[PDB]
Structures are given as structure tokens and as C-alpha cells.
């Protein structure tokens, strides 16, 4: 406002326990200070004024005001700062993610005096956490429905095939599920397209599931993609998939939106199916390290809106500068109390108030020689998707599933006995691939990795 400290930058202010905190990383134009830029970010995402001539008729003021309470520099980067600001609780609707997004990130990202702006984290109070539904089932309930204890679950997307009839699709699904996998995933581009409509696909996939589950002895599934053009088409696909007796469905929450995802999560909670969320079109928002919305914010918003599985990305190839951040936001969506740790990317202390957790899905070009690492990093509360590491076995679809199953069982059983999994990965796999030709062929096709000379 004046020499007077902007009425918005109040560094001696401590936030209540019912305030929504937000941490922006901003970089301002040449010739603009940092404190004024912080106060301006605080005023843009609220009443858009510093003065008091508009929002003063009788008494209402300073209540619906986003005070900014911390500005610091970023170590290493030049001309780049962290701004912590804090919003009241009366600004937000009860049970709506759309409103929170539209209120925080509505039109601040277009501020002219700012060269770049990123939203790094966010903290929801418990008073606001308890007005949302959360995931339909969670981790324990979903583990009890399928009756899979101890090990992580396996899956195999059918990604590269396209233009397949519905019957050959059902046949490949049957061959995979019979061999020893647990789930199977539709390509996310597949919808009601002229070479393969949706009702035929649903019919034949259901037939394959029933056959393989009846002749194997355990519960098996297939993520059917119910993403549709309208609310009506989506609910119609979901009703028909429940009629056939399917345990789990699929959806993507960035092209379809948050209104459709909330609606589908409430339907899934009423009717008792599990929901698998597929993060597509996300690199458009959270790839560049200087503008956009980091992905942990969207992971939190998804844990609030609804979803049981979530794609999180593997960490077998990343360095410790990003493996740390990914492990951070993987703990942000499984546990119940997360302490602030800036090395792992967590900015605020978050308490989830006994809301269930979601389940991380690790996918994308992985094969058998990675199994020791994954079982050590993600733990056993996760899902592992094998795109090409299954359908490419030298002699079929079912043998590849058998190979992956054998490798996973060997690795888990070895971990239970105390053996290390970073020094003895190759040893475990080689000594297990001796009484089974499938695992021998699989080990011979791909190649060992030897992560970093002994470990990591």
C-alpha cells in the first residue's frame, strides 16, 4: 500500500489450525522487489485490492483476505523465491475440489509483474478434509476384497496392439490372466471407436474373466475404461459393467475433469466397485520446473476427490534429486501423518484424519531384472504393471505371466528371510531361474542392470 507493510505481508503472523496454506515458487520481473511480489500474489488470489475503498460498506473486510506470512530465497537458483501465504476457511465450498482450484490458481498465474509462478504444495486443514468423501474403499478394504496378502499385485497392460477385434482382445486377456497375473488394463486410448465398440469389448472381457477365475481359483479382474463424452454415457457404461459382475473400472481425471471424477467416485462407493485413476495429459501441467502445478498437489486433490489406485511413476532410473521427491509424495498418499521434510519435497505437516490411502501403481517399460529393486522401494503396498515385459516372451503370453509371477514370488520370499535385495538381486533371480524354463528364457532375453556398483 505504502511504506506501511502492504497490509498483506505480515511476517509476525502465525496461521491458525483452520487455515489453508499454500507455497508458491515465483520469479519476478527485473526491477520489482520480492516482498511486493509476495503481497501481490496474496492479493490476486483474493479480493484484488490492497486498499480499502471497495470492500468496506459497513464491516466486512480482512476476513476474506489472504495474508502472506513468509518469503524466503531459494538456495542455488538466482532470482527465485518461496512465498508461503494463508487463506481463511470461509472462502471454500464444502466438498468441492473445483472451487478450491478456481479460488487458489484461478487467475494469479497470469499476473504481469511475475515472470514465472509454480505451486509447490498445499495444506488442507482437518476441518476441510472431513467434508470430502475420500477414496471409495482404500487399501485395507481393497486388499480384503481381492484376498491378496503379503505380496504386491501384478498387472499387464495391452498397449501396443491397436485395431484388434473384440474376440482376439478377450483371448489375449484370457491367456494373460490364466498364466498367473492379477489385473489387466485397457489402453487408455480405447473407447467406443468404429473398429471396436464398447459393449462387445465388455462382453468378451467378462467371459474371459469368468473362465480364467473359475479354472484357476483366485479373484481376477480387468480395468474397463468407462471414460465417455457425457455424464449419461459414463453412468451407462458403469452400470453395464457392474451388471456383468466386474470388480474394478478405470477413468482419467485430467481430460474428463473433477466433476465427473467426483460423480463416478460416489457411484463406486454406493455400488461397491474399485476405481483406478489414470494420469494422462499431466506433463502439460507439471513438467517444466519453473511454471505450472507440481504433481503432489494433484495427488492430494485426487486423494480427496476419490480413487483407489493412482499412477505414480517408477524411481528405478531417477537420481536422488528426484527419487527423493517421488518417495515423498508416495508417502503423502499412503500414510496418515506426514512430517515436514524439505529434502523430500514435503513443505507442510499434513494430518489426514483417518482417511484411507490410495495405492501407487508403478509402470512403464520394466522387466524381470527390476523386480528386486521395486519390491525394495515401493514396499508391498503397491501395484506393478508390465507393459512389454510380459507380452514379448519368446514363446507366448501365458509363459510370460508365469515368468513374472515366479520372479516376484522368489524376490518376496527372499526378502522375508533377511537377505539383502540390492546386493543379491541377480543372485536370487539366477538361483530361482533353474527349475523353471520360463524364467530362464525371460532372464536370457533382457539384460542385468547393476544399479550403482552395490546399491541404489
Amino acid at each position: 500500500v505504502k511504506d506501511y507493510k502492504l497490509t498483506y505481508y505480515t511476517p509476525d503472523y502465525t496461521p491458525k489450525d483452520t487455515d489453508l496454506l499454500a507455497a508458491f515458487r515465483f520469479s519476478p520481473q527485473p526491477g520489482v522487489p520480492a516482498d511486493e511480489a509476495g503481497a501481490a500474489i496474496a492479493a490476486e488470489s483474493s479480493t484484488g485490492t490492497w486498499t480499502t475503498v471497495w470492500t468496506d460498506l459497513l464491516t466486512d473486510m480482512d476476513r476474506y483476505k489472504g495474508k502472506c506470512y513468509h518469503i524466503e530465497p531459494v538456495q542455488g537458483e538466482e532470482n527465485s523465491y518461496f512465498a508461503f501465504i494463508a487463506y481463511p476457511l470461509d472462502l471454500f465450498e464444502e466438498g468441492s475440489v473445483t472451487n478450491i482450484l478456481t479460488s487458489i490458481v484461478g487467475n494469479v498465474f497470469g499476473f504481469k509483474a511475475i515472470r514465472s509462478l509454480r505451486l509447490e504444495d498445499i495444506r488442507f486443514p482437518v476441518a476441510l478434509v472431513k467434508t470430502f468423501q475420500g477414496p471409495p474403499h482404500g487399501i485395507q478394504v481393497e486388499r480384503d476384497l481381492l484376498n491378496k496378502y503379503g505380496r504386491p499385485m501384478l498387472g499387464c497392460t495391452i498397449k501396443p496392439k491397436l485395431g484388434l477385434s473384440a474376440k482376439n482382445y478377450g483371448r489375449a486377456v484370457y491367456e494373460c490372466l490364466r498364466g498367473g497375473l492379477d489385473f489387466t488394463k485397457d489402453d487408455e486410448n480405447i473407447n467406443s471407436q468404429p473398429f471396436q465398440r464398447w459393449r462387445d469389448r465388455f462382453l468378451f472381457v467378462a467371459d474371459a474373466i469368468h473362465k480364467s477365475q473359475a479354472e484357476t481359483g483366485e479373484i481376477k479382474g480387468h480395468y474397463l475404461n468407462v471414460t465417455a463424452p457425457t455424464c449419461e454415457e459414463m453412468m451407462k457404461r458403469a452400470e453395464f459393467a457392474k451388471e456383468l459382475g466386474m470388480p474394478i473400472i478405470m477413468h482419467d481425471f485430467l481430460t474428463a475433469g473433477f466433476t465427473a471424477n467426483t460423480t463416478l467416485a460416489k457411484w463406486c462407493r454406493d455400488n461397491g466397485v474399485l476405481l483406478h485413476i489414470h494420469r494422462a495429459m499431466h506433463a502439460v501441467i507439471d513438467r517444466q520446473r519453473n511454471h505450472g502445478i507440481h504433481f503432489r498437489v494433484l495427488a492430494k486433490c485426487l486423494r480427496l476427490s476419490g480413487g483407489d489406485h493412482l499412477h505414480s511413476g517408477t524411481v528405478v532410473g531417477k537420481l536422488e534429486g528426484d527419487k527423493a521427491s517421488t518417495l515423498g509424495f508416495v508417502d503423502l498418499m499412503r500414510e496418515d501423518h506426514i512430517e515436514a521434510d524439505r529434502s523430500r519435497g514435503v513443505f507442510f505437516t499434513q494430518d489426514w484424519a483417518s482417511m484411507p490411502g490410495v495405492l501407487p501403481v508403478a509402470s512403464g517399460g520394466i522387466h524381470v531384472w527390476h523386480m528386486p529393486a521395486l519390491v525394495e522401494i515401493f514396499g508391498d503396498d503397491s501395484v506393478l504393471q508390465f507393459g512389454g515385459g510380459t507380452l514379448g516372451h519368446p514363446w507366448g503370453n501365458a509363459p510370460g505371466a508365469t515368468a513374472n509371477r515366479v520372479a516376484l514370488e522368489a524376490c518376496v520370499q527372499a526378502r522375508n528371510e533377511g537377505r539383502d535385495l540390492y546386493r543379491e538381486g541377480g543372485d536370487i533371480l539366477r538361483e530361482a531361474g533353474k527349475w523353471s524354463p520360463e524364467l530362464a528364457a525371460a532372464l536370457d532375453l533382457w539384460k542385468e542392470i547393476k544399479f550403482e556398483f552395490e546399491t541404489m
Binding site: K2, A43, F111, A113
Partner: protein, 79 residues
């Protein structure tokens, strides 16, 4: 009064035409609150309340419509 640009302060974001206060002093009655001359048809005669501010002695700033800073959204999206 009439300056060329919207006029941020030197190396800052604060508005200049008001120095951050958001309101300015009426440039018709000179803050007095009473007319000085006849204006349209002798219907606003000298001696009564100012025709512009109507006795408040203060009007809204122009370059920064009460925002106090320039780069905002109720003062800037004319670019």
C-alpha cells in the same frame, strides 16, 4: 494530474497517482466541497455541493481503480 503512463513508482509496484492510498482529492472543488462557478445550464450554481464528488471531497483513483498496485486484474487487463 494527467501523466502519460499508468505510472508505477520507481522500482516498485505501488500506484503513483494516489501513492497507494487508492483515492485522490477532487480536482473540481479543490477539496472544499462547494461549487465555484456555473457549469451546464445554471443548474449547478456556485455555493451548493460540488457537482462531481457530491461533498465527499474524495474520488476514486483512475490508473489503479482502488487496487493500489498496477499489475492486478481490475487495473491492467487492457494490454
Amino acid at each position: 494530474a494527467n501523466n502519460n503512463p499508468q505510472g508505477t513508482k520507481p522500482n516498485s509496484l505501488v500506484c503513483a497517482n494516489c501513492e497507494g492510498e487508492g483515492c485522490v482529492a477532487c480536482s473540481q472543488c479543490k477539496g472544499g466541497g462547494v461549487n465555484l462557478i456555473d457549469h451546464f445550464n445554471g443548474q449547478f450554481k456556485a455555493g451548493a455541493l460540488c457537482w462531481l464528488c457530491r461533498g465527499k471531497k474524495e474520488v476514486l483513483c483512475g490508473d489503479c481503480n482502488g487496487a493500489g498496485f498496477i499489475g492486478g486484474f481490475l487495473s491492467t487487463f487492457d494490454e
